[PDB]
Amino acid sequence: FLKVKNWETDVVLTDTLHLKSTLETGCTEHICMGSIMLPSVATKDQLFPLAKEFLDQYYSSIKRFGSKAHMDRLEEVNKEIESTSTYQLKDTELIYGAKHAWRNASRCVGRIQWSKLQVFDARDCTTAHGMFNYICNHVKYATNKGNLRSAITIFPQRTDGKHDFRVWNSQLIRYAGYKQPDGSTLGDPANVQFTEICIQQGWKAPRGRFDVLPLLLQANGNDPELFQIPPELVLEVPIRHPKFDWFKDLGLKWYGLPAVSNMLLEIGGLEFSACPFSGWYMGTEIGVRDYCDNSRYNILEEVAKKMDLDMRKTSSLWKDQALVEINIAVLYSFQSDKVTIVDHHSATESFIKHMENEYRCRGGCPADWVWIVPPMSGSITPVFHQEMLNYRLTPSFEYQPDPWNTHVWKG
Amino acid sequence: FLKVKNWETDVVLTDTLHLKSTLETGCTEHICMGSIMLPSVATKDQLFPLAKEFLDQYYSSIKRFGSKAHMDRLEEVNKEIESTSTYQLKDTELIYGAKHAWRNASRCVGRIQWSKLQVFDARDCTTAHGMFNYICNHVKYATNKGNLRSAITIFPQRTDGKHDFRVWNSQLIRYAGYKQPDGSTLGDPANVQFTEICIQQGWKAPRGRFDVLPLLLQANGNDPELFQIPPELVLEVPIRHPKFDWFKDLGLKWYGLPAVSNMLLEIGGLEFSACPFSGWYMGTEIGVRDYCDNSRYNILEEVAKKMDLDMRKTSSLWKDQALVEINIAVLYSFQSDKVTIVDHHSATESFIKHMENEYRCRGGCPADWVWIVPPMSGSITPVFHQEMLNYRLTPSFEYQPDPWNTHVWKG
Numbered sequence: 001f002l003k004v005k006n007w008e009t010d011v012v013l014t015d016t017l018h019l020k021s022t023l024e025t026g027c028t029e030h031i032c033m034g035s036i037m038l039p040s041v042a043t044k045d046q047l048f049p050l051a052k053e054f055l056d057q058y059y060s061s062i063k064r065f066g067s068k069a070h071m072d073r074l075e076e077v078n079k080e081i082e083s084t085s086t087y088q089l090k091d092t093e094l095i096y097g098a099k100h101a102w103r104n105a106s107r108c109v110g111r112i113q114w115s116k117l118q119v120f121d122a123r124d125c126t127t128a129h130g131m132f133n134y135i136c137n138h139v140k141y142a143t144n145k146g147n148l149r150s151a152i153t154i155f156p157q158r159t160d161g162k163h164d165f166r167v168w169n170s171q172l173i174r175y176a177g178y179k180q181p182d183g184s185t186l187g188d189p190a191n192v193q194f195t196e197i198c199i200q201q202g203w204k205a206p207r208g209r210f211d212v213l214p215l216l217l218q219a220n221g222n223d224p225e226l227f228q229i230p231p232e233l234v235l236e237v238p239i240r241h242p243k244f245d246w247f248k249d250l251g252l253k254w255y256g257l258p259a260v261s262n263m264l265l266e267i268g269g270l271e272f273s274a275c276p277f278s279g280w281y282m283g284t285e286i287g288v289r290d291y292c293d294n295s296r297y298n299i300l301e302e303v304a305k306k307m308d309l310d311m312r313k314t315s316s317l318w319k320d321q322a323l324v325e326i327n328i329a330v331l332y333s334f335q336s337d338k339v340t341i342v343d344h345h346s347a348t349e350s351f352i353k354h355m356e357n358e359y360r361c362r363g364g365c366p367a368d369w370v371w372i373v374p375p376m377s378g379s380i381t382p383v384f385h386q387e388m389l390n391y392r393l394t395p396s397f398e399y400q401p402d403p404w405n406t407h408v409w410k411g
Numbered sequence: 412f413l414k415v416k417n418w419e420t421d422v423v424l425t426d427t428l429h430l431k432s433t434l435e436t437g438c439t440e441h442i443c444m445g446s447i448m449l450p451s452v453a454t455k456d457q458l459f460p461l462a463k464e465f466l467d468q469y470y471s472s473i474k475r476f477g478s479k480a481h482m483d484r485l486e487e488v489n490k491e492i493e494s495t496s497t498y499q500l501k502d503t504e505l506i507y508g509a510k511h512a513w514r515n516a517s518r519c520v521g522r523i524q525w526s527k528l529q530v531f532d533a534r535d536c537t538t539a540h541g542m543f544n545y546i547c548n549h550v551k552y553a554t555n556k557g558n559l560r561s562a563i564t565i566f567p568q569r570t571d572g573k574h575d576f577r578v579w580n581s582q583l584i585r586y587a588g589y590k591q592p593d594g595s596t597l598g599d600p601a602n603v604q605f606t607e608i609c610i611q612q613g614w615k616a617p618r619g620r621f622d623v624l625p626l627l628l629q630a631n632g633n634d635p636e637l638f639q640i641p642p643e644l645v646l647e648v649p650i651r652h653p654k655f656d657w658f659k660d661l662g663l664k665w666y667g668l669p670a671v672s673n674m675l676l677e678i679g680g681l682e683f684s685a686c687p688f689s690g691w692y693m694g695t696e697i698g699v700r701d702y703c704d705n706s707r708y709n710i711l712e713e714v715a716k717k718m719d720l721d722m723r724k725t726s727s728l729w730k731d732q733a734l735v736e737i738n739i740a741v742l743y744s745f746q747s748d749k750v751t752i753v754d755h756h757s758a759t760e761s762f763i764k765h766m767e768n769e770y771r772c773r774g775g776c777p778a779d780w781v782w783i784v785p786p787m788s789g790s791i792t793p794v795f796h797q798e799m800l801n802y803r804l805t806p807s808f809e810y811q812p813d814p815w816n817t818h819v820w821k822g
């Protein structure tokens with residue numbers, strides 16, 4: 001019945017939710033792997049315990065634990081796992097499972113919103129075109145004219161393994177990355193291998209900077225196909241500073257909608273290999289990681305110059321100073337456009353408040369300190385000072401291999 | 412034989428040193444405690460294995476593993492643990508053990524220096540006055556006119572338990588903290604309970620801000636006694652900015668020498684309860700933690716004002732902007748005074764290089780990501796992007812209770 005302390009407010013909370021934890025973390029009694037980025041077909045025997053566990057907590061949630069309805073649904077799913085060696089989720093069960101996959105995502109600082117999630121049931125989808133249509137309506141709904149709304153679209157679950165629905169993009173909206181004749185890189189270096197796959201499958205690249213990538217959609221295990229998101233559905237924010245008018249000359253912009261598409265949603269032992277989900281951006285993901293990561297857009301070089309900073313000396317903190325301006329500007333631009341965004345102080349304060357609620361009415365909140373603390377100004381945000389216990393609850397979002405490493409291809 | 416990756420350079424290194432790990436981390440297979448700050452008399456039976464292990468690696472180090480000298484020293488220490496149920500370290504063994512306690516300190520970003528350590532053997536000390544004298548010569552030597560040098564002074568080891576040598580200060584040099592009649596706090600709020608103990612034992616407090624605290628020294632389990640470090644031995648740096656002359660008006664200064672005095676040094680199963688050790692400061696400990704921690708000096712309030720920043724809105728990043736100036740100033744002040752200091756970019760780069768050396772010639776480097784990453788500008792330093800394995804090797808520095816919670820007092 002462990003305790004976690006906050007070393008800024010002296011607040012203690014008691015965690016018992018970790019007792020319901022099931023999966024393994026990577027750590028042992030003699031080694032901690034909490035800074036490792038990714039540490040490590042199904043059968044019908046394994047499937048009923050997972051189904052039972054999920055069903056027991058779902059009916060526990062609607063305040064009908066063990067009622068006739070719960071007992072009949074247990075027997076019903078049991079027999080469906082006899083008949084088909086799989087089963088199907090109720091609409092209500094799918095919405096509960098998705099909302100709790102988010103709720104349980106220990107690397108997510110935005111979970112105070114977890115119960116406000118819009119679930120789009122695309123389990124009737126059969127083709128890549130159908131996926132494109134579903135994905136388009138997700139983008140339009142979640143963007144909502146810049147008044148962004150959280151959403152997830154859930155495609156058919158894995159069955160045999162070789163019939164998988166997969167979005168090959170890592171995010172629904174990403175900027176292209178092309179290498180150069182002189183060896184360097186234009187666009188987004190993260191995506192250079194994906195940008196090349198698109199071209200290998202027929203993409204005709206407008207080889208510039210902020211070129212939105214096309215979708216690569218694989219349906220029912222078939223080879224994936226290219227589709228272009230109507231550019232009117234792709235909302236973008238131009239980045240200006242509220243002081244420095246040379247900022248516009250920098251010519252930077254980002255897309256409004258963060259939408260992860262490469263993860264796996266697990267519910268009651270069922271695996272949804274395509275489940276794109278979207279929220280809104282925290283400022284630092286664009287301004288610190290996207291723009292100033294050394295292997296991403298890498299703009300500290302220029303923003304420092306155009307401020308005339310002492311770049312000769314490492315200890316002038318020219319890099320730090322240019323970093324704060326960039327994030328004031330990303331924020332400023334998004335807000336003056338009514339496009340939803342959150343600064344890393346408001347987001348981290350909300351997560352402390354979210355943590356308090358979870359410990360009260362749930363007995364804990366799995367949390368990954370390495371990922372919750374923002375990538376700048378860490379100790380002036382309250383989560384730096386907050387002990388967190390990390391553990392794996394289900395339903396959950398999991399990593400999965402890139403599909404071009406697994407897909408027994410064909411044509 | 413685990414692997415750790417750097418996600419900025421794609422470099423991989425292989426860790427086998429973790430196999431020599433002995434102590435437990437707090438984590439299990441189902442919970443990770445890597446963000447918990449402090450997770451959890453000796454006998455003669457437990458003592459020989461610890462002595463043997465330490466001796467086997469010491470003689471392995473001087474390239475005489477298993478020689479006659481090693482076999483005789485094993486038998487000699489064995490028999491001394493028969494005779495006294497304890498044993499005594501050789502001068503060479505004490506220096507090796509201390510240097511490796513540092514080398515093994517997974518929370519320390521400065522370990523590239525671990526083999527340059529000056530060891531002061533105070534095991535002949537018998538009185539609090541003798542401790543004062545030893546501590547004074549440590550301060551003078553390590554300060555070295557601002558050309559700081561690393562050092563440790565090792566007082567008699569624990570024997571029965573009730574005869575402990577302890578420095579009651581948490582650091583040799585700290586600023587006093589006094590509460591106020593109006594409820595607030597002057598000085599350093601961290602130390603308000605220690606500042607009060609000093610007064611309860613007879614300290615006459617010059618109730619101001621940067622008042623250097625007196626030593627509280629307990630010798631051979633006796634009640635501790637107060638001593639004032641000659642102020643000429645306490646080097647201090649006045650904090651000015653290289654742009655903002657209102658900075659001097661702020662009237663800030665810090666002491667040059669970071670010297671931890673409350674930790675326990677463990678060598679071959681022997682426990683040195685008083686082992687003050689000192690290096691030089693990394694800029695962010697003063698400028699970010701000491702000055703801008705909410706429960707420390709808490710100056711973001713004023714530095715923001717005197718810059719005229721948008722403090723009405725949380726998302727103006729006024730706090731971030733005022734943070735970068737303060738750390739440019741702490742650094743600038745220390746350097747213009749020839750007083751050794753390191754910026755968080757140079758320090759974190761050196762630790763990557765140190766990590767590479769350890770994996771090569773040692774098979775690993777225990778490392779605590781939560782503590783290695785600096786408390787500001789985290790992801791623009793290379794350690795943010797560096798996976799680290801944490802594990803506990805011995806010799807080691809350990810936490811221990813504050814002595815005023817344990818000391819069976821008297822007079």
Ligand code: HEM
Nearest residue numbers: 102105107108109110113150151277278279280281282397
């Ligand atoms: C509501 C607005 C949201 C905000 C402000 C937010 C914030 C964040 C941030 C800053 C990250 C770190 C991303 C990174 O550094 O790679 C993250 C990760 C994550 N978010 Fe949230 N998020 C939001 C909505 C959502 C939604 C709707 C879901 C799922 C339904 C979700 C699930 C996750 C997951 C699973 C991760 C982990 C990604 C990984 O491990 O690579 N978030 N979130």
Ligand code: HEM
Nearest residue numbers: 513516518519520521524561562688689690691692693808
């Ligand atoms: C050579 C210059 C050094 C630098 C730049 C340096 C840097 C640091 C920093 C920034 C911390 C974090 C302190 C905190 O946030 O509380 C730390 C912790 C630590 N340092 Fe180093 N250090 C140096 C020398 C030393 C020496 C000489 C020793 C021991 C002989 C040492 C042992 C430790 C230990 C044991 C900790 C952990 C303290 C704790 O867990 O609370 N360091 N160091």
Ligand SMILES: CNCc1cc(F)c(F)c(-c2cc(C)cc(N)n2)c1
Nearest residue numbers: 171258259260277278279280281282
């Ligand atoms: C591989 N890391 C995952 C990842 C990469 C990105 F690019 C993101 F934008 C987000 C993300 C996702 C959501 C729903 C909200 C938010 N604020 N960020 C997550």
Ligand SMILES: CNCc1cc(F)c(F)c(-c2cc(C)cc(N)n2)c1
Nearest residue numbers: 582669670671688689690691692693
């Ligand atoms: C309880 N945390 C430990 C702690 C507190 C402090 F105030 C320090 F200054 C240091 C420290 C120690 C050394 C040898 C070098 C350095 N750069 N910092 C460590």
Ligand SMILES: C[C@H](O)[C@H](O)[C@H]1CNc2nc(N)[nH]c(=O)c2N1
Nearest residue numbers: 035036037370371795796797798
């Ligand atoms: C090595 C380390 O685990 C890696 O850099 C992690 C650190 N924490 C992070 N935290 C967030 N939010 N996003 C990230 O990509 C990372 N990267």
Ligand SMILES: C[C@H](O)[C@H](O)[C@H]1CNc2nc(N)[nH]c(=O)c2N1
Nearest residue numbers: 384385386387446447448781782
């Ligand atoms: C909760 C958390 O473990 C605590 O704030 C830690 C985080 N990392 C730290 N890292 C350093 N270097 N120093 C600290 O005091 C802390 N505090």
Ligand SMILES: [Zn+2]
Nearest residue numbers: 027032438443
């Ligand atoms: Zn761990």
